[PDB]
Design a protein around this ligand. Sequence first.
Ligand SMILES: [Br-]
Ligand SMILES: [Br-]
Ligand SMILES: [Br-]
Ligand SMILES: [Br-]
Ligand SMILES: [Br-]
Ligand SMILES: [Br-]
Ligand SMILES: [Br-]
Lengths: 14, 339
Amino acid sequence: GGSWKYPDAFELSG
Amino acid sequence: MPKTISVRVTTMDAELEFAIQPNTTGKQLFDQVVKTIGLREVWFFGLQYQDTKGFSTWLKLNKKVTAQDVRKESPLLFKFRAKFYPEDVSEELIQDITQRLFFLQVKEGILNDDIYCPPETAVLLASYAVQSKYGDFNKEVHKSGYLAGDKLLPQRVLEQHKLNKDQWEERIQVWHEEHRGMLREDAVLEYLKIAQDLEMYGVNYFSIKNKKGSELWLGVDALGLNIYEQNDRLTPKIGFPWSEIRNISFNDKKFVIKPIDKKAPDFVFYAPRLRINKRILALCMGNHELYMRRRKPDTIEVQQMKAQAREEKHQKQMERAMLENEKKKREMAEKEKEK
Ligand SMILES: [Br-]
Ligand SMILES: [Br-]
Ligand SMILES: [Br-]
Ligand SMILES: [Br-]
Ligand SMILES: [Br-]
Ligand SMILES: [Br-]
Ligand SMILES: [Br-]
């Protein structure tokens, strides 16, 4: 169910 | 092709076991780990594995576990580890579990000589490790050799001095005795407050070369990038904090640091392979995001954890004062008994 988009356990901002 | 994807995850103090599906993502596995152990300050952490070529690698949370070249075995072996380090442990490791995981990992790196530590600091650190594990020194219980079963000092410190185990124990005991009254969880925090100021603390080093082919080290850490001499990983030769970087980029083996200052030249280095440059850049992006996040307002979750920490601490202080005072009431009644 692979919706998490980031390499680590927090979001990267633009 | 195997019928199971059995997975073991080892933390600094527990061994966990899971059984995942072909399409299970990194994030899904990671979320099962942190839920199991009761960790909420998850941002600092990662799942490290050995790839098929023997290189330590971080699991990408945005990809399937089975698509990442994890060494094939039953079970798959991961180490749950702090990947990112705070700028200040007192401000940023809110919860006691977070502090304990950091403490155990950092202490491993000190004892295994990964993280250089001078002897006097190593004895001071050992004393806090001992207060945490043993509590207050108690002359009725802690006799000569009470530490004999313990790995307490870096190998370099042991090898480069002439002291025997008894002499090391006595030096650590002096400090242990000074800590009497200190809560175990407070000794863990004092350990980390010392360790976080070591020169190698929280640094990832990559082997690189300049254009001439001279060997150097790149360090990546919470505050930016650093270039080091091949033979000194303590003191940067050139520092590149975030505030001085305009852009970092790579092109195959070539990595370029472009400064904000127009007078300063680009810094160029070369890695052995593109994959290394990709590793550096990913680690720099993670660090810089966390750097920016700690300068923005607290999330609602972080505020909750901070208020829960203040209340739990306040409560334990009150109960401790109550128990000390009850003990005095008892010791008074034991002595006005005799009349
Ligand atoms: Br996911
Ligand atoms: Br560490
Ligand atoms: Br301990
Ligand atoms: Br490229
Ligand atoms: Br490559
Ligand atoms: Br590599
Ligand atoms: Br890496």
